[PDB]
């Protein structure tokens, strides 16, 4: 996701963690983050050139079709396997498990934004369009690519039409209904049987909305308003709050 996206998945997160994960957080980041997670959620877009081995961390690859298996695709260019998004969760939340040789700053910083990014339907999808990135299509009169679209345009199309420039109303109507309209599939969100974290779970589930929502009805050239706009929106909510309970359950079981 772009900025907006990765603020709101923090900003819901760093809400919902328990006494020791919300100490650790506290204690892990850096001074100038004045206590505030989402105040570096887009940190680790800032290091893809100055560590260059870490630019592959951020999505997963699949063949064309709704699938994605860990073995199969969790892999970089070179073939490396665990080199993918749910590798680097593994990674992450592994060293945290450390807490109290690695930068734990940085495993927090990564773990914050890459729950966050294996979320975003089309940061788990086509190596052949490279997630979307080579669908040249119009958000409204403007041009963008299909993957820009569900990383940004969207969101910040509904902070502005919607919620009148206040991404906090956004923020807190997705933490309202949390409480209020999906209670019960936020505690299957949070269930992880795994040590720490479940990324494949949240791949596959991305992938078949990549296949049924984000690329779907879109071809080269089309123009996506209203109708994708409105249509849409309620599954980047959806992965949204998946985000934002997500990280906080996970940080909660590491630090507890
Ligand atoms: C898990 O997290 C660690 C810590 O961030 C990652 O370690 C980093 O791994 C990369 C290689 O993938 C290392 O870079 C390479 O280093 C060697 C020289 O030491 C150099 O020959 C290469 O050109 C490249 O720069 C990097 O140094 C290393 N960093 C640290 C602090 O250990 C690891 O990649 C992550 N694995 C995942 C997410 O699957
Ligand atoms: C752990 O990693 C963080 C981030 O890479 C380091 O913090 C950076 O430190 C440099 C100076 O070395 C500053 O210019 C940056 O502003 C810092 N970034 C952040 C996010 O605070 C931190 O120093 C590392 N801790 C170590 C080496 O023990
Ligand atoms: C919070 O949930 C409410 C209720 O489901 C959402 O409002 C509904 O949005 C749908 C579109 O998905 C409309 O067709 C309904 O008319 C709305 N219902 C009501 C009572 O207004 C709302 O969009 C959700 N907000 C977030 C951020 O998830
Ligand atoms: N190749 C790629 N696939 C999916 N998401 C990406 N974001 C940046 N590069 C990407
Ligand atoms: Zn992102
Ligand atoms: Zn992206
Ligand atoms: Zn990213």
Same mark, same amino acid.
């Given at each position: 996701w772009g900025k907006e996206g990765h603020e709101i998945i923090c900003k819901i997160a760093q809400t919902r963690l328990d006494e020791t994960a919300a100490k650790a957080v506290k204690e892990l980041l850096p001074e100038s983050a004045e206590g505030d997670l989402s105040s570096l959620c887009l940190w680790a877009d800032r290091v893809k050139f100055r560590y260059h081995w870490?630019?592959?961390?951020?999505?997963?690859?699949?063949? =064309?079709?709704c699938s994605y298996q860990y073995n199969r695709d969790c892999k970089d260019e070179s073939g490396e396997k665990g080199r993918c998004v749910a590798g680097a969760i593994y990674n992450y939340t592994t060293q945290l498990l450390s807490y109290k040789q690695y930068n734990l700053t940085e495993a927090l910083l990564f773990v914050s934004h890459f729950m966050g990014d294996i979320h975003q339907?089309?940061?788990?999808?086509?190596?052949?369009?490279?997630?979307?990135?080579? @669908?040249? #299509?119009?958000?409204?009169?403007?041009?963008?690519?299909?993957?820009?679209?569900?990383?940004?345009? @969207? @969101?910040?199309?509904?902070?502005? =039409?919607?919620?009148?420039?206040?991404?906090?109303?956004?923020?807190?109507?997705?933490?309202?209904?949390?409480?209020?309209?999906?209670? =019960?599939? #936020?505690?299957?969100?949070?269930?992880?049987?795994?040590?720490?974290?479940?990324? =494949? @779970?949240?791949?596959?589930?991305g992938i078949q909305a990549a296949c049924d929502w984000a690329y779907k009805g879109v071809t080269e050239g089309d123009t996506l308003e209203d109708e994708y706009f409105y249509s849409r929106l309620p599954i980047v909510y959806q992965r949204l709050a998946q985000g934002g309970v997500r990280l906080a359950a996970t940080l909660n079981r590491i630090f507890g």
């Amino acid at each position: 996701w772009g900025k907006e996206g990765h603020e709101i998945i923090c900003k819901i997160a760093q809400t919902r963690l328990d006494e020791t994960a919300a100490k650790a957080v506290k204690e892990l980041l850096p001074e100038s983050a004045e206590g505030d997670l989402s105040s570096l959620c887009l940190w680790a877009d800032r290091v893809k050139f100055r560590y260059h081995w870490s630019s592959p961390l951020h999505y997963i690859n699949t063949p =064309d079709a709704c699938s994605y298996q860990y073995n199969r695709d969790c892999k970089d260019e070179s073939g490396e396997k665990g080199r993918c998004v749910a590798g680097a969760i593994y990674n992450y939340t592994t060293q945290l498990l450390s807490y109290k040789q690695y930068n734990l700053t940085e495993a927090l910083l990564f773990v914050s934004h890459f729950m966050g990014d294996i979320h975003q339907p089309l940061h788990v999808s086509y190596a052949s369009d490279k997630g979307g990135n080579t @669908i040249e #299509v119009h958000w409204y009169t403007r041009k963008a690519n299909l993957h820009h679209i569900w990383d940004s345009n @969207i @969101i910040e199309t509904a902070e502005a =039409d919607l919620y009148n420039s206040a991404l906090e109303g956004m923020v807190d109507a997705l933490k309202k209904n949390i409480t209020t309209e999906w209670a =019960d599939q #936020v505690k299957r969100w949070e269930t992880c049987t795994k040590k720490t974290a479940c990324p =494949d @779970i949240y791949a596959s589930e991305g992938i078949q909305a990549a296949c049924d929502w984000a690329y779907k009805g879109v071809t080269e050239g089309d123009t996506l308003e209203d109708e994708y706009f409105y249509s849409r929106l309620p599954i980047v909510y959806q992965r949204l709050a998946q985000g934002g309970v997500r990280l906080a359950a996970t940080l909660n079981r590491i630090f507890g």
